[PDB]
Design a protein around this ligand. Structure first.
Ligand SMILES: [Ca+2]
Lengths: 255, 236, 273, 43, 236, 59, 43, 43
């Protein structure tokens, strides 16, 4: 009697439900797990706050307009002010984690539009200027707000080119990364489970973003006649298997 | 003092040979490998993944609308799109398959084309996808088209239709670079019935098309691409 | 024998493999026998040439530089005069190989370096000089050459090769990354500072190579050009990405030209063949 | 054919063989719930 | 007359290769080895020995006072010393560890810092030694400092305190040459209470600090040092 | 509401110790359930005994 | 890997292997009476 | 005489041996009905 469409995800003291899912992607066919001794370098003991950080945090909502270009969030950056997770993220020299990303967008059997929801490991952004100019720290560290692609470009910030994935590659090939679609006629949500992917066992959570969640309208939003021309897009994210180390005084970052 | 005779080619540097050489850092210990998800062993592994085809090639500048195939309501018997099957050129050149195919000289195998419907849930349609083997001209109408490999698509819950383009060829390998003798035929789309939209709905609906290779696929004779070049060496 | 295709006949089932849901993010392995009546055929193929070992296993030019052999008497800047030169080993200055490497996110391998040195005497000279080049591997922290005949060329601990112009030098180098793999991409910074660079990491450092002609000077000047080729052996690659579409403009940066707007070829009609 | 290593360091050796452990699934079907070709993609 | 083919690199002289060569003195008999105490097999053997750190870097000329850390009586909450953890530079550059570390490119491992008290026997004190992992600024006060790896030292019969600096790092190897991405954090010292001198005693008391590597340690990629050079060849 | 409508609601329980949430951001930091409106007409959220002392007064 | 000596004299051979008999003690604990980490250095 | 292949690819090897499976018949007597030397070519 059960369906691939109705699902529940319980993580800590938060439970999410969807009645219009389209399965879910488990990046590179790998589920998150803690760091093993064989892989460990750092001799320190890791802190595992569990259910206090491994729960769902909901980001500030977005508004899908018929002219929308897309949005980009960088992790662990987007969750740096989220309760005890953000705290831990700034008291330790190193951390490690995976996530459960849940993107939401409900509509009407009269609407049509399609979103591409993708997770890109190491999304090194291109600068507005080009040349040898780098994208300033604060521009890749927007926090919860993320990068709104239809915002005017500034000096030292990224390009606002969805067509070029903000990195010099083409949009259509973004399908090589773990992704999922939100096709209104079908979908309601998109869920992606992300394991820890990095060339080092553990890392600094502030000077390096391991991934950037990208939500990009492909098929323009087309609402029924007399209906409101927009739809909100909500992103809920839960850290899973989080570990922290190198505890000390509060990390000091720019701003 | 073992007598030898050196052969032609002695001292040449063939970029493609594979021999032993002394290590400049003797006794050096490389960092231990750690587990990293997403290991790629063969390129044939990744071309099996479908990526979008910029079929709406119309325009002057690249734009997200190149990936959107327009569909019109209450049109009957009409043609939706057409294209040659040159995977190293045209609409397929920028795709992941065409991108990797261009690093090789020969190709062989079956292709996978999926068409995903994005129109309202309360709409309906029946489309016809066709593959015309080499030997003739691209179909000029649905009647001509349906005489070849085709799939009738009924739009519904199942959002995507998948059609495989079976290896239809005399010679066992075709060139990736567009060559007449080794052409793969045509691909076209038409309305079997027509798109029907519900009340309070209007405008165009779009189709998303994906391309990937079947397990059938093979690519040989590695070479340099035409998809990247430079006039000067880069610097920091 | 592995089967490329099996014999398959007519159908009329409730099992519809032609229909799926790309919303899921998956690509199901359909075969032509799912939509066509087929015949049995054999692969007669293993896929050797597409193995990443193959793909990155051939030498590619990764740098071209120049040095000279004059009379260094009265010359105050040997480097500018071209008596010796450097090279901060990087594999993203020449684009042919860079696009290949970047098909993946993290990459681990051993390097097989082949160095070619050819000579030229563009102006009036009685004969062609037979020169010897020294190539020194200068790890970060080791003292940098300042003059063409410094104590640095003593190279007591730094590996160095001596070879003749017209000849070639070949040696292998172990994976020298401080991490478990090389980063083709790195969405990070060295430290959380508002002005520090982005992308470029010591996590890609392979070193710096110093070059010079060991011989003194003749009556004429001799111009030596050095070409460095790199071959990857014992390859390991993780996380495939989208191919590069736009031109490259800088080393270690994903930056692309802002006036480049038409990468995809255009038609006029979506219906034409 | 035959090959014996003339050098002490592993880096010195020639090219590694063919992996023969291809598996496009991690990239083509990284879905949580298994989907079977022929059955409803979504039920 | 065995056919061969010579390869690229033929005739090169790579200072780092290891092959056989003919002996210029064939049939020669070397002097017999006699037993000699103090055989060194690996450099990792000797960096485990602690040597003094010239922490009192203040001054213009080298002088025995560079090894002496000043301590003041009746001072409370105050800072005794601070330094970055750049073993290939700063205060550690001349030490035996830093001296040998500079012959290698990468380093990894835990460090040992001992502080030996030389003040009168009839005095007392409680000091706090701290290690601040990378990611922030050096502590500005004891409160900030104690939030990291630290040891509270009670001065007594046991003259020395030993604190190990556990490998606290993401990447498995750091560069010996000061590089930002591969920095090791800070090291600082403060009074937990204060130094108390007995009657008929006055002035400054000093601390001697030693540095050595733990068995944890590793050093790779041998290279030339910056701690020695020359402008001309030497003669007798 | 009608069958042809849609919505996603968030129900939250804020344990004792603070003020009532002032916005969804504050709210979601506690025990909560994200509700997807569909065929299944009702959502059920349990308020787990979150307390120091084992009994509370009804008054 | 393989190696056969082509010359008569022992000097002609290549580099000797890794000692694997490290012992920092002769340098780090050359004390007459044994000291045990954890117990009073001086009693 | 002896030969060992020094390369991985089959193309790299030297010349193939003598076929020793000559059969001029496919060219000299491709007749349907067998003709026997000495008997009437046509009866
Ligand atoms: Ca002459």
């Amino acid at each position: 009697g059960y369906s691939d469409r109705v699902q529940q995800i319980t993580l800590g003291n938060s439970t999410i439900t969807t009645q219009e899912a389209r399965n879910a992607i488990v990046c590179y066919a790998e589920w998150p797990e803690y760091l093993s001794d064989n892989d460990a370098s750092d001799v320190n003991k890791t802190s595992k706050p569990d259910i206090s950080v491994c729960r769902f945090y909901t980001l500030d909502s977005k508004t899908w307009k018929a002219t929308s270009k897309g949005w980009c969030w960088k992790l662990p950056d987007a969750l740096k002010d989220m309760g005890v997770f953000g705290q831990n993220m700034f008291y330790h020299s190193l951390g490690r984690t995976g996530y459960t990303i849940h993107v939401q967008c409900n509509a009407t059997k009269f609407h049509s539009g399609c979103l591409l929801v993708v997770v890109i490991p190491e999304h090194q952004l291109a600068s507005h200027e080009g040349g040898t100019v780098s994208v300033k720290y604060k521009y890749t560290h927007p926090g919860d707000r993320g990068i709104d692609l239809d915002t005017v470009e500034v000096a030292g910030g990224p390009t606002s080119d969805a067509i070029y994935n903000m990195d010099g590659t083409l949009l259509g090939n973004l399908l090589i990364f773990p992704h999922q679609f939100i096709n209104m006629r079908t979908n309601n949500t998109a869920t992606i489970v992300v394991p820890y992917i990095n060339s080092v066992p553990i890392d600094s959570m502030t000077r390096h973003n391991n991934v950037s969640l990208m939500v990009v309208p492909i098929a323009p939003l087309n609402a029924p006649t007399g209906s409101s021309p927009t739809l909100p897009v909500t992103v809920t994210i839960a850290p899973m298997c989080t570990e922290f180390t190198g505890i000390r005084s509060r990390s000091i970052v720019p701003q | 003092g073992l007598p030898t005779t050196t052969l032609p080619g002695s001292g040449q540097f063939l970029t493609t040979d594979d021999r032993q050489s002394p290590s400049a850092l003797p006794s050096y210990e490389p960092t231990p490998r750690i587990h990293i998800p997403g290991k790629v062993r063969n390129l044939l592994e990744i071309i099996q993944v479908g990526t979008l085809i910029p079929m709406n090639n119309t325009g002057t500048n690249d734009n997200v609308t190149n990936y959107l195939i327009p569909l019109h309501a209450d049109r009957q018997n009409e043609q939706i799109f057409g294209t040659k099957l040159y995977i190293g050129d045209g609409v397929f050149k920028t795709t992941l398959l065409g991108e990797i195919a261009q690093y090789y000289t020969h190709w062989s195998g079956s292709l996978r084309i999926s068409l995903m419907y994005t129109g309202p849930a309360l709409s309906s349609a029946k489309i016809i996808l066709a593959y015309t083997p080499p030997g003739t001209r691209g179909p000029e109408d649905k009647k001509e088209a349906m005489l070849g490999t085709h799939v009738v698509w009924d739009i519904g819950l199942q959002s995507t239709i998948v059609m495989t383009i079976p290896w239809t060829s005399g010679v066992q390998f075709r060139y990736t670079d567009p060559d007449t003798y080794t052409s793969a035929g045509y691909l076209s789309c038409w309305y079997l019935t027509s798109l029907i939209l519900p009340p309070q709905t209007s405008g165009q609906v779009y189709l998303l098309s994906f391309i990937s290779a079947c397990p059938d696929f093979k690519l040989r004779l590695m070479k340099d691409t035409q998809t990247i070049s430079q006039t000067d060496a880069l610097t920091e | 024998q592995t089967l490329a295709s099996v014999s398959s006949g007519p159908k009329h089932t409730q099992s519809v493999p032609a229909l799926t849901a790309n919303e899921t993010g998956a690509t199901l392995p359909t075969r032509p026998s799912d939509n066509v009546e087929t015949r049995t055929t054999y692969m007669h193929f293993n896929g050797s040439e597409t193995d990443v070992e193959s793909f990155l296993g051939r030498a590619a030019c990764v740098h071209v530089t120049e040095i000279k052999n004059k009379n260094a008497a009265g010359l105050d800047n040997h480097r500018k005069e071209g008596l010796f030169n450097d090279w901060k080993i990087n594999l993203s200055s020449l684009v042919q190989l860079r696009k290949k490497l970047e098909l993946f996110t993290y990459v681990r391998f051993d390097s097989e370096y082949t160095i070619l040195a050819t000579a030229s005497q563009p102006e009036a000279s009685s004969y062609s000089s037979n020169l010897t080049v020294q190539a020194m591997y200068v790890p970060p922290g080791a003292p940098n050459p300042k003059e063409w005949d410094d104590y640095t060329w003593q190279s007591a601990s730094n590996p160095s090769v001596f070879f003749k112009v017209g000849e070639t030098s070949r040696f292998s180098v172990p994976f020298v990354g401080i991490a478990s793999a090389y980063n083709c991409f790195y969405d990070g910074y060295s430290h959380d500072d508002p002005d520090t660079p982005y992308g470029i990491t010591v996590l890609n450092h392979m070193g710096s190579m110093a070059f010079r002609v060991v011989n003194e000077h003749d009556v004429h000047t001799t111009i030596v050009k050095i070409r460095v080729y790199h071959r990857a052996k014992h390859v390991e690659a993780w996380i495939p990405r989208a191919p590069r579409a736009l031109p490259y403009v800088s080393i270690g940066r994903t930056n692309y030209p802002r006036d480049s707007k038409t990468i995809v070829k255009k038609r006029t009609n979506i219906k034409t063949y | 054919y035959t090959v014996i290593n003339y050098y002490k360091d592993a880096a010195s050796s020639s090219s590694a063989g063919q992996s023969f452990s291809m598996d496009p699934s991690k990239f083509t079907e990284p879905v949580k719930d298994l989907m079977l070709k022929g059955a409803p993609a979504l039920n």
